[PDB]
Write a protein that binds this ligand. Structure first.
Ligand SMILES: Nc1ncnc2c1ncn2[C@@H]1O[C@H](COP(=O)(O)OP(=O)(O)OP(=O)(O)O)[C@@H](O)[C@H]1O
Ligand SMILES: Nc1ncnc2c1ncn2[C@@H]1O[C@H](COP(=O)(O)OP(=O)(O)O)[C@@H](O)[C@H]1O
Ligand SMILES: [Mg+2]
Ligand SMILES: [Mg+2]
Lengths: 534, 107
């Protein structure tokens, strides 16, 4: 026998993955546990590989090494994908050839009695005549993946190998590498849920518990419910950062204060270090990024009147609809209005008030000088990342700039438009939700390009349209010392005021650059000059 | 016997439920080869990639004694946009040529 029928995978390594082990062992490797006599009598061949895909750094290689060890196999021969590639002619294939040598010789001298060799790959998608389909010129020869296939299953047969491959993008894997007789069993390693984030944390902090270095203050259930969508590597980094910060705190404190030796030896880390590191040190990749909001909502949100509440309530209703309904797992919306009316800030607030696990903002500020194909790739990557969580919220910052629209011509890029139009109507995998919020300042152009037929709703962000609203906004913004405000109220009673909030901030700040005498007249003149009406 | 190739086009207003009816008609035929070629899985491809993909999906249907292929959202395959107009000539030509090519004898 090679293992007891029920196997075992816990406390020695792998954390939150326990169903995965049973599934893989019941599906594929059932031919190496049955009694050998019946296996020989039946006359069946064993599987010759498996494939594992999923997020990056979620615990794939550990499972590979464990499965290799538990079969009573020789030491694994790891190798990395992009490393076997050379500019010389006919040298990217000698590298592939130079990995099956020992197995070949051992099968040569000893036939049908050898052991097993595991040849774990990594980033197996680098060598594939399929990445060239996507826009660009990268043919990767297409001879490399004809020298690997011809060795696994060719005119000469090997019966003492087991190839395990891992990849991050399952959609660029060549089709000729998944037929029966070759890599022929797929499997997914998803993100860890609550129980996994508990087990991994328990595993990674046993040593410090053994010597009682950890204080009794810290719990683990609290830290297993705050970390949402963390991957295991992130948890390990969190523990390490907590250790380091506690160490630095203790050294600094005991150095500054000549404490007695009792606490000097004691190196308790407490819980404050944990929360400090969690909130200041580690930044997840598949979770909320609480830092960039401060770069968009720069001056809070002021309630100058009625419309703000209406907009926020509509956003709440759409969020609620997408959260708790079936038969409709994809929802869209579009915010539009006159320029400088504050459309981005409201979108950011609506997204933030949802409390979703995964929030992302795709704006053109980070695509300066990009060619259009790069923009398409970036958008596709963001959406792909968003597809890997139970709930999500993706914002598109400015749709008129993504297309490079210019009134002369008109001119724009077709590729981005078509990619967006296709992506707005693609449902996620079964059982997962999504929500998309747009933004723009030219509704008519999008209406003309047949783009307003893909969105599902629309919201209007009105502008300051009366003197009373301007007066209330100024009062809440707290300027002009309430005495010049009486003259301002007298002057702005006309009610023919059409100005944006951001422009209002700019005008107030500009007018505040003179002495108390001419400030009011300067501000009134500036407002009157820019007083264009619909 | 004197007509080994047929075609049909479903048309109507938007949001009318055309793809569902096409799929339901296809699934109710009991043909041994049944494929679908939609633009939902070609995001970011250039024109030549689309041509090669369509040609590949069509080539297989000539290796089976029966088949039924479906082409979905012809408008999005050609990259149409009312401004201009603009579109991909090469894909249109490939489609116009593939719509009138009978399979090898018998099929
Ligand atoms: N009620 C409010 N609504 C929106 N923005 C507000 C409000 N109160 C204050 N602000 C401030 O107004 C600014 C919002 O301007 P924002 O960048 O959203 O303009 P915009 O109309 O999207 O710009 P552009 O059209 O040039 O892209 C931020 O400073 C925000 O703090
Ligand atoms: N389920 C898990 N339990 C404990 N540690 C894990 C788990 N998954 C990943 N890790 C940690 O992640 C690291 C290995 O990452 P790995 O899975 O090799 O990334 P990749 O999939 O990119 O190869 C190890 O240091 C290990 O401690
Ligand atoms: Mg804007
Ligand atoms: Mg359709």
């Amino acid at each position: 026998s090679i293992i007891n029928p029920d196997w075992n995978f816990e406390k020695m390594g792998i954390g939150g993955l326990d169903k995965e082990f049973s599934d893989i062992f019941r599906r594929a490797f059932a031919s190496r546990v049955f009694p050998p006599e019946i296996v020989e009598q039946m006359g069946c061949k064993h599987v010759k590989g498996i494939l594992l895909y999923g997020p990056p750094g979620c615990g794939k290689t550990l499972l590979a090494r464990q499965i290799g060890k538990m079969l009573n196999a020789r030491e694994p021969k790891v190798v990395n994908g992009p490393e076997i590639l050379n500019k010389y002619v006919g040298e990217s294939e000698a590298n592939i050839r130079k990995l099956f040598a020992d197995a070949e010789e051992e099968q040569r001298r000893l036939g049908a009695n050898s052991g097993l060799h595991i040849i774990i790959f990594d980033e197996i998608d680098a060598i594939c005549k399929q990445r060239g389909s996507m826009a660009g010129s990268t043919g990767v020869h297409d001879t490399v993946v004809n020298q690997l296939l011809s060795k696994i299953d060719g005119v000469e047969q090997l019966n003492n190998i087991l190839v395990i491959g891992m990849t991050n993008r399952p959609d660029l894997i060549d089709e000729a590498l998944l037929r029966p007789g070759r890599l022929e069993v797929k499997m997914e390693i998803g993100l860890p849920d609550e129980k996994g984030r508990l087990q991994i944390l328990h595993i990674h902090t046993a040593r410090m518990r053994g010597h009682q270095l950890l204080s009794a203050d810290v719990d683990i259930k609290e830290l297993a419910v705050e970390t949402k969508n963390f991957s295991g590597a992130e948890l390990e980094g969190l523990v390490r950062a907590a250790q380091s910060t506690a160490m630095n705190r203790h050294i600094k404190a005991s150095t500054k204060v000549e404490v007695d030796m009792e606490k000097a030896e004691s190196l308790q880390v407490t819980r404050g270090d944990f929360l400090a590191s969690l909130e200041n040190d580690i930044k997840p990749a598949f979770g909320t990024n609480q830092e960039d909001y401060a770069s968009y909502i720069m001056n809070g949100i002021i309630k100058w009147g009625d419309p703000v509440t209406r907009v926020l309530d509509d956003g709440e209703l759409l969020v609620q609809q997408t959260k708790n309904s079936d038969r409709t797992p994809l929802v869209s919306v579009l915010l539009e209005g006159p320029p400088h009316s504050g459309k981005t800030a409201l979108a950011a607030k609506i997204a933030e008030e949802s409390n979703f696990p995964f929030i992302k903002i795709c704006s053109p500020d980070k695509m300066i000088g990009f060619s259009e194909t790069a923009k398409c790739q970036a958008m596709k990557k963001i959406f792909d990342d968003a597809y890997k969580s139970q709930l999500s919220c993706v914002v598109v910052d400015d749709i008129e700039r993504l297309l490079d629209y210019v009134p002369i011509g008109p001119r724009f890029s077709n590729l981005v438009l078509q990619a967006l139009l296709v992506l707005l109507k693609k449902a996620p995998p079964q059982g997962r939700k999504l929500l998309i919020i747009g933004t723009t300042s030219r509704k008519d152009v999008l209406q003309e390009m047949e783009m307003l037929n893909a969105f599902s709703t629309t919201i209007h962000v009105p502008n300051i349209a009366t003197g009373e609203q301007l007066l209330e906004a100024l009062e809440l913004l707290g300027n002009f010392k309430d005495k010049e405000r009486t003259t301002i109220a007298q002057q702005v009673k006309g009610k023919k005021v059409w100005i944006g909030i951001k422009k209002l901030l700019m005008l107030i700040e500009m007018s505040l650059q003179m002495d108390p005498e001419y400030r009011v007249r300067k501000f009134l003149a500036l407002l009157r000059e820019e007083g264009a009406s619909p």
